[PDB]
Amino acid sequence: MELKDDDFEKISELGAGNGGVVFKVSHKPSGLVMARKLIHLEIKPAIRNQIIRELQVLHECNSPYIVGFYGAFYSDGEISICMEHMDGGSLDQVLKKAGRIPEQILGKVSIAVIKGLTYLREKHKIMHRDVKPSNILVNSRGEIKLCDFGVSGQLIDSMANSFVGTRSYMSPERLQGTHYSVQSDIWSMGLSLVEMAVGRYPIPPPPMAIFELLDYIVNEPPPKLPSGVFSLEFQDFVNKCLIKNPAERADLKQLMVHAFIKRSDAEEVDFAGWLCSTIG
């Protein structure tokens, strides 16, 4: 869209994670209100421009289930990724205001997440590589969209994601040296669903620093939903997502026809209204 740091004006901070900070900004010359993610990396100009070059592909993403992209550029040691502003935030934020999320809302989220993944896989042959509650954004129109996926191979390598932060959604196969695949996103999604359903990160079942957590994941059995509160469909769905053997774990075709999804797809759920009310 042709953006440059002076076009912008800061409205407020939407939040920060381990690797960056996101601002709600005004893009003055167009009038657009967007979210601006700033990423700071101590890398040589060569690979940096390679990142901005690779990030340019986000322009060709165009799906109801994928967050909107406006442009990526570099300035002042910061890489800027400029997005559709999502007025409802991430599901990780909603989760703090709501404590936990209803399995009917979660069925809608799953249908969104599944469709978004398939879109990225069918249309761009990229895997998401970071499906978690904080990377699922919602807005007051009741839309549910994925962001922060691995569009840039250079950017992935530079961020050394795997050891940072306190929670991990990495799958067993990956932490045992397997090549990355869509199955690994299924595991992430199920672990996400469990976390959003019960209201806390499932591993371990009710201090653990990253490496122990990672060891715990490849060794202990997978997390499961509690015993009385959720339908037996929702927990078979989540169970089929968290099968430790990627061979057995369900795939997107299978999940899309699972009992839980068929029902959720039919249930008349007012997500926007549930949202503006849970957080207003």
Ligand SMILES: O=C(NOCCO)c1cc(CN2OCCCC2=O)c(F)c(F)c1Nc1ccc(I)cc1F
């Ligand atoms: O922003 C990111 N992650 O957030 C961390 C920094 O706050 C981000 C990270 C990576 C690299 N990566 O790929 C996933 C596996 C782990 C990993 O390290 C990447 F390739 C990206 F393109 C990113 N941004 C991004 C993508 C789509 C939209 I629409 C908007 C965006 F901002």
Ligand SMILES: Nc1ncnc2c1ncn2[C@@H]1O[C@H](COP(=O)(O)OP(=O)(O)NP(=O)(O)O)[C@@H](O)[C@H]1O
């Ligand atoms: N397009 C957007 N619209 C509104 N809020 C956003 C948008 N993108 C990101 N955010 C918020 O900005 C904050 C940080 O996002 P982010 O930088 O990716 O850290 P994170 O994904 O939460 N954890 P991590 O990826 O490990 O650093 C979160 O609270 C998001 O909900």
Ligand SMILES: [Mg+2]
């Ligand atoms: Mg994120």
